[PDB]
Design an enzyme around this catalytic site. Structure first.
Site, mmCIF file in Angstrom:
data_model
loop_
_atom_site.group_PDB
_atom_site.id
_atom_site.type_symbol
_atom_site.label_atom_id
_atom_site.label_comp_id
_atom_site.label_asym_id
_atom_site.label_seq_id
_atom_site.Cartn_x
_atom_site.Cartn_y
_atom_site.Cartn_z
ATOM 1 N N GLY A 9 0.836 -1.194 0.000
ATOM 2 C CA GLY A 9 0.000 0.000 0.000
ATOM 3 C C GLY A 9 0.870 1.243 0.000
ATOM 4 O O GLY A 9 1.983 1.183 -0.482
ATOM 5 N N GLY A 12 4.164 1.107 2.052
ATOM 6 C CA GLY A 12 4.999 0.069 1.482
ATOM 7 C C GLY A 12 5.630 0.499 0.176
ATOM 8 O O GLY A 12 6.793 0.236 -0.081
ATOM 9 N N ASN A 98 0.371 2.848 12.569
ATOM 10 C CA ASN A 98 -0.269 3.661 13.573
ATOM 11 C C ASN A 98 -0.992 2.703 14.450
ATOM 12 O O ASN A 98 -1.245 1.577 14.043
ATOM 13 C CB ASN A 98 -1.175 4.727 12.926
ATOM 14 C CG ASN A 98 -0.387 5.981 12.605
ATOM 15 O OD1 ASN A 98 0.392 6.447 13.444
ATOM 16 N ND2 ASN A 98 -0.529 6.500 11.395
ATOM 17 N N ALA A 122 2.429 9.668 2.760
ATOM 18 C CA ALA A 122 2.199 9.067 1.466
ATOM 19 C C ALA A 122 0.716 8.832 1.343
ATOM 20 O O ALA A 122 0.127 8.114 2.141
ATOM 21 C CB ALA A 122 2.947 7.753 1.338
ATOM 22 N N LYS A 176 2.046 9.459 20.394
ATOM 23 C CA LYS A 176 1.288 9.402 19.145
ATOM 24 C C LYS A 176 -0.124 8.777 19.346
ATOM 25 O O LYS A 176 -1.127 9.269 18.820
ATOM 26 C CB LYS A 176 2.014 8.591 18.092
ATOM 27 C CG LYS A 176 2.719 9.398 17.009
ATOM 28 C CD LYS A 176 2.482 8.807 15.586
ATOM 29 C CE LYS A 176 2.563 7.229 15.522
ATOM 30 N NZ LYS A 176 2.866 6.669 14.159
ATOM 31 N N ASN A 180 -3.908 10.111 18.541
ATOM 32 C CA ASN A 180 -4.772 9.288 17.706
ATOM 33 C C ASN A 180 -6.111 8.966 18.418
ATOM 34 O O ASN A 180 -7.160 8.958 17.780
ATOM 35 C CB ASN A 180 -4.058 7.994 17.407
ATOM 36 C CG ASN A 180 -3.695 7.857 15.991
ATOM 37 O OD1 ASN A 180 -4.338 7.077 15.280
ATOM 38 N ND2 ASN A 180 -2.623 8.567 15.553
ATOM 39 N N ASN A 241 -7.268 18.435 7.046
ATOM 40 C CA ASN A 241 -7.228 17.045 6.625
ATOM 41 C C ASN A 241 -8.446 16.279 7.085
ATOM 42 O O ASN A 241 -9.020 16.564 8.119
ATOM 43 C CB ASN A 241 -6.026 16.293 7.251
ATOM 44 C CG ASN A 241 -4.669 16.800 6.792
ATOM 45 O OD1 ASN A 241 -4.518 17.912 6.271
ATOM 46 N ND2 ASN A 241 -3.658 15.980 7.039
ATOM 47 N N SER A 244 -7.391 9.465 8.801
ATOM 48 C CA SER A 244 -7.406 8.115 8.281
ATOM 49 C C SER A 244 -8.627 7.328 8.746
ATOM 50 O O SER A 244 -9.179 6.561 7.963
ATOM 51 C CB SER A 244 -6.108 7.357 8.652
ATOM 52 O OG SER A 244 -5.981 7.146 10.046
ATOM 53 N N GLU A 256 -8.896 0.976 12.369
ATOM 54 C CA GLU A 256 -7.866 0.628 13.344
ATOM 55 C C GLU A 256 -8.255 0.816 14.808
ATOM 56 O O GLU A 256 -7.416 0.810 15.687
ATOM 57 C CB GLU A 256 -6.597 1.459 13.011
ATOM 58 C CG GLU A 256 -5.841 0.781 11.866
ATOM 59 C CD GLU A 256 -4.653 1.553 11.351
ATOM 60 O OE1 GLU A 256 -4.713 2.805 11.295
ATOM 61 O OE2 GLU A 256 -3.666 0.887 10.951
HETATM 62 N N1 LIG Z 1 3.605 8.513 8.747
HETATM 63 C C1 LIG Z 1 3.253 7.373 9.352
HETATM 64 N N2 LIG Z 1 3.817 6.928 10.594
HETATM 65 C C2 LIG Z 1 3.443 5.720 11.218
HETATM 66 N N3 LIG Z 1 2.517 5.007 10.573
HETATM 67 C C3 LIG Z 1 1.954 5.416 9.396
HETATM 68 C C4 LIG Z 1 2.305 6.594 8.751
HETATM 69 N N4 LIG Z 1 1.635 6.709 7.604
HETATM 70 C C5 LIG Z 1 0.844 5.639 7.536
HETATM 71 N N5 LIG Z 1 1.045 4.863 8.610
HETATM 72 C C6 LIG Z 1 0.390 3.621 8.938
HETATM 73 O O1 LIG Z 1 0.849 2.502 8.191
HETATM 74 C C7 LIG Z 1 -0.253 1.590 8.123
HETATM 75 C C8 LIG Z 1 -0.487 1.379 6.589
HETATM 76 O O2 LIG Z 1 -0.912 2.598 5.993
HETATM 77 P P1 LIG Z 1 -1.058 2.719 4.445
HETATM 78 O O3 LIG Z 1 0.192 2.400 3.751
HETATM 79 O O4 LIG Z 1 -1.738 4.059 4.209
HETATM 80 O O5 LIG Z 1 -2.167 1.587 4.212
HETATM 81 P P2 LIG Z 1 -2.849 1.146 2.888
HETATM 82 O O6 LIG Z 1 -2.193 1.785 1.733
HETATM 83 O O7 LIG Z 1 -3.243 -0.279 2.970
HETATM 84 O O8 LIG Z 1 -4.174 1.978 2.929
HETATM 85 C C9 LIG Z 1 -4.066 3.177 2.191
HETATM 86 C C10 LIG Z 1 -5.131 3.303 1.129
HETATM 87 O O9 LIG Z 1 -6.244 2.307 1.056
HETATM 88 C C11 LIG Z 1 -7.071 2.492 2.240
HETATM 89 O O10 LIG Z 1 -6.993 1.271 3.095
HETATM 90 C C12 LIG Z 1 -6.521 3.762 2.935
HETATM 91 O O11 LIG Z 1 -7.572 4.589 3.446
HETATM 92 C C13 LIG Z 1 -5.693 4.495 1.851
HETATM 93 O O12 LIG Z 1 -6.469 5.263 0.914
HETATM 94 C C14 LIG Z 1 -1.414 2.268 8.863
HETATM 95 O O13 LIG Z 1 -1.374 1.957 10.298
HETATM 96 C C15 LIG Z 1 -1.123 3.721 8.646
HETATM 97 O O14 LIG Z 1 -1.766 4.533 9.646
HETATM 98 P P3 LIG Z 1 -3.314 5.120 9.340
HETATM 99 O O15 LIG Z 1 -4.243 3.924 9.265
HETATM 100 O O16 LIG Z 1 -3.204 5.913 8.036
HETATM 101 O O17 LIG Z 1 -3.554 6.152 10.522
#
Ligand SMILES: Nc1ncnc2c1ncn2[C@@H]1O[C@H](COP(=O)(O)OP(=O)(O)OC[C@H]2O[C@@H](O)[C@H](O)[C@@H]2O)[C@@H](O)[C@H]1OP(=O)(O)O
Length: 292
Positions: A9, A12, A98, A122, A176, A180, A241, A244, A256
Site C-alpha cells: 500500500g 509500502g 499507527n 504518502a 502518538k 490518535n 485534513n 485516516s 484501526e
Molecule cells: N507517517 C506514518 N507513521 C506511522 N505510521 C503510518 C504513517 N503513515 C501511515 N502509517 C500507517 O501505516 C499503516 C499502513 O498505511 P497505508 O500504507 O496508508 O495503508 P494502505 O495503503 O493499505 O491503505 C491506504 C489506502 O487504502 C485504504 O486502506 C486507505 O484509506 C488508503 O487510501 C497504517 O497503520 C497507517 O496509519 P493510518 O491507518 O493511516 O492512521
C-alpha cells in the site's frame, strides 16, 4: 541489503521505491497473493517510479536481511506470524504502523522485533501513491528482549532520510497514540476535518486526562496538559485534513479502532483506570463499523 516489504500500500510503496533507488534488493509481500507487487509512486519533485516487483517469493523471504512491515495495525500480527517460520530467526522484523497492541500479539516471535513511526506522508490518489511530505522515521526495540539494531537506522537513513534509532520508541508511540485516540474517532464520528475538533476543548481534555492516566501507569511520565498541547499542535498542523479513521468510515473499510482507543481500553483495564470517554468513542466507532 535484501528486504521483504510486507504491505504494498502507500507506505509500502514509499519504502519499496526508496529502497530500489538505492539498489537494495527488494520484494513485496501481499496478504492476498498476486503474482507481483505494483509500485507507482510520484515523488516530492514530481518524478515517477512505476515498477512491477517480485512478490511473495518464500525463498527470497527466507534469505531476507529485514522484513519491513507496513500493514495496517489490525492486519499485522497474523501476517507476521504466518511468515515468521520462514524468515530466518536472526532476521529483524520492523513494524511501522499507527496504533498499538500488535506487539502484545507478537510476544512469541523469536526474531528481533522492532517498531517504528514516521512523519513522511504518502497518500493514495487513484492507483498512484504520492509522496506528499518528507519526514523523520524513528525505530527501536519492540520488547525489552530486543537488542541494538541501530545499524538499521544507519542504513535506512541513506534510503529515506531521516531515520534514527530510539531506545525509547515506546514512549514516542504512546504520545502518538494519545493524539490518535482524540483525532481519529472524533473526526470519524462527527464526519469533520481535524480542525473542527478545536471547538470541543472539554472532550479533548477529558480524553487526554484518561490517556495520561494510563501512560503514567505504563511507566512513562506525562501530563494531560502536555498531551492536549500536542493534540492541538497536531490539529493545527492538519486542520483541513480528513483523518485516516474518517476516510475508513466514509469508504466502508474496517478501522484501526481496536489498536487505538481499543488498546487504550485494554491497558486502562489492566491498571484499574476508568476511561468512560474513550469507551464511548470506541463503542461508537464499532457501531458505525457494523453498519457496513
Ligand atoms: N507517517 C506514518 N507513521 C506511522 N505510521 C503510518 C504513517 N503513515 C501511515 N502509517 C500507517 O501505516 C499503516 C499502513 O498505511 P497505508 O500504507 O496508508 O495503508 P494502505 O495503503 O493499505 O491503505 C491506504 C489506502 O487504502 C485504504 O486502506 C486507505 O484509506 C488508503 O487510501 C497504517 O497503520 C497507517 O496509519 P493510518 O491507518 O493511516 O492512521
Amino acid at each position: 541489503m535484501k528486504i521483504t516489504v510486507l504491505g504494498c500500500g502507500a507506505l509500502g510503496q514509499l519504502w519499496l521505491t526508496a529502497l530500489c533507488k538505492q539498489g537494495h534488493e527488494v520484494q513485496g509481500w501481499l496478504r492476498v497473493p498476486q503474482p507481483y507487487c505494483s509500485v507507482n509512486l510520484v515523488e516530492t519533485d514530481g518524478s515517477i517510479f512505476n515498477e512491477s516487483l517480485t512478490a511473495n517469493d518464500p525463498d527470497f523471504l527466507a534469505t531476507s536481511d529485514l522484513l519491513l512491515v507496513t500493514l495496517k495495525a489490525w492486519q499485522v500480527s497474523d501476517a507476521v506470524k504466518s511468515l515468521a517460520s520462514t524468515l530466518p530467526v536472526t532476521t529483524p522484523i520492523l513494524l511501522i504502523h499507527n496504533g498499538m497492541g500488535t506487539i502484545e500479539e507478537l510476544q512469541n516471535i523469536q526474531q528481533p522485533l522492532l517498531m517504528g513511526t514516521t512523519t513522511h506522508a504518502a497518500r493514495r490518489d487513484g492507483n498512484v501513491i504520492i509522496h506528499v511530505a518528507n519526514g523523520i522515521t524513528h525505530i527501536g526495540p519492540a520488547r525489552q528482549q530486543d537488542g541494538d539494531y541501530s545499524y538499521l537506522a544507519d542504513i535506512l537513513q541513506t534510503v529515506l532520510p531521516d531515520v534514527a534509532w530510539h531506545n525509547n520508541i515506546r514512549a514516542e508511540l504512546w504520545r502518538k497514540l494519545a493524539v490518535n485516540c482524540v483525532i481519529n474517532p472524533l473526526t470519524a464520528i462527527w464526519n469533520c476535518p481535524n480542525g473542527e475538533l478545536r471547538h470541543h476543548p472539554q472532550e479533548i481534555m477529558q480524553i487526554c486526562e484518561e490517556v495520561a492516566a494510563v501512560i503514567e501507569r505504563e511507566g512513562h511520565h506525562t501530563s494531560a496538559e502536555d498531551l492536549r498541547d500536542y493534540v492541538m499542535q497536531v490539529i493545527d498542523a492538519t486542520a483541513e485534513n480528513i483523518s485516516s479513521m474518517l476516510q475508513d468510515i466514509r469508504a466502508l473499510r474496517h478501522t484501526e479502532i481496536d489498536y487505538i482507543n481499543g488498546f487504550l481500553l485494554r491497558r486502562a483495564r489492566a491498571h484499574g483506570i476508568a476511561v468512560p470517554e474513550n469507551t464511548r468513542l470506541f463503542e461508537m466507532v464499532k457501531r458505525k463499523e457494523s453498519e457496513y
